[PDB]
Symmetry: D2
Subunit: 159 residues, 4 copies
Amino acid sequence: NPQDEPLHYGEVFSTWTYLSTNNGLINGYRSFINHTGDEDLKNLIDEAIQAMQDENHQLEELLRSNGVGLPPAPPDRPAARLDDIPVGARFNDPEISATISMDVAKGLVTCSQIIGQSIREDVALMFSQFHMAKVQFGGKMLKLNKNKGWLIPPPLHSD
Amino acid sequence: NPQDEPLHYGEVFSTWTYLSTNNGLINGYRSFINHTGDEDLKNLIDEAIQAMQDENHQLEELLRSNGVGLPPAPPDRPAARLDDIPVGARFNDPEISATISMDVAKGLVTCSQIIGQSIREDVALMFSQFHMAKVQFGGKMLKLNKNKGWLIPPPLHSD
Amino acid sequence: DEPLHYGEVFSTWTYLSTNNGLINGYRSFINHTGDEDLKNLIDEAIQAMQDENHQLEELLRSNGVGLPPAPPDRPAARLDDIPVGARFNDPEISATISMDVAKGLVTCSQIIGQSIREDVALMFSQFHMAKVQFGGKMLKLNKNKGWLIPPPLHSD
Amino acid sequence: DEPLHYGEVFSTWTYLSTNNGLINGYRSFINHTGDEDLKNLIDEAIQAMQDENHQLEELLRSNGVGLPPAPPDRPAARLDDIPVGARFNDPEISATISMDVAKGLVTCSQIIGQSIREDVALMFSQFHMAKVQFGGKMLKLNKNKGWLIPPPLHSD
């Protein structure tokens, strides 16, 4: 029974940190919903928020069951009208999408790091599942960026 | 003469990507200046922007001298009044600071990655210098977060 | 039909090169191994990397990229012929491989996240899943053999 | 006076453990090495890790954290006594160490970025600088010896 073994310090710190990262990203993405015009991007931000909330439910149960204090999360946000945001304070759709895409890429790496350092099998499996879901979400972001013409092409190999 | 040798594909992609990352962060941080109340945080955001612009000058010269196309950067931003930002669109000081601190930590890692994969000595040395500066800036961010009471304490070891 | 980007080429060429190096190293480790449960897992790792390499070599060759050098043939050796100071012991070998697998998970995720060509992202997502399963087998071996060094433990 | 956080303890204990493993492995590599310029650099790496380890063991001991096991004594061996299939050759050894150094740079940066205690950040910033210099020596060796495999090159 994996959950009758203690977590190690790395497992505790990494999962606590991941949960805190999610809390911060939920808050930022809730702000991005208010800054976004594009409805396709908005839908994906909403999906990301929900996905992180699902991850959080599992993480919080893990930490609560193992006597680890939870990190404080920023609160939910009011709605705002897009046209009321001063231009200099406004995040635009391509840059919102870029940010989220980079966040997803970083999250893939963090999942792999946690799996690699895990000794409790349940922790490894949780992050394996998170990684599988995040690969799919990342693929949706790439499709969006392609469809919208937001992707900046890097230097290309000539065959 | 290092600069008479061709860059390898990794050096090109990594430096191009780093420059693009800087361009995006400059744009986001210019928006954060408009969202910030705290003058100490504002000063550090301004310092970060200037530091990235200095890095960019070197990166752009490297790429321009080696026949690599530069990534397009978002433009500069107008000033905005803090009180005109709808609450639901507003980024608050602790969360701005957290974001920048995470960005700095990620940048340290990216610098080390580039140094490690470098074969041209000038590329390794450039990133070594960037890393040294970024360590100092990161230490200033930590001091800020401590001073302001913005740092969330992680689980602590009991000796 | 879309070209690979510089990062896709560099990352895939480097991952292939890494596998080639690890196949050579692990072939040597097989000659240093006493424990046959460990040996069987090294064999599995080698075959898996060889399987990945067929896919990567095809991708690179089909896109006009020169391949890194293949692993050389390596003969068997008798464990007992290895001088003591030159011998890697079973827990040392296991720790090395375990660390290599953990690193490789991270590399796969890095490649996925920087890929624009969907076929590259797909390939490395499949490699990642395989490495998750393999790392899981290594962990079970290390626990079963008593080779794992416990890190600092949280107390609930 | 401030306690270490869980990440500081886990990261420092793990970095120490890693150094201990690499000291053992590199001692073995010395016995496999023909080239004396390579051997001298392995000796330098070992001594450097030992120097880091004195600092880390003190930090951990002073904060009530149990230390990981120290490297065991490892005798010398004659290169010519190593069966061919068990022998790591000079370029293989060099590639391994070069990769270890690159990984170690990244680990140092990771520890710096997650540190809250200034003394931990300072320590790893100093280790990082040392590894930058050492990796630079490894690269020069690999170039001088003709061991570097060129990756795909950009054309200006």
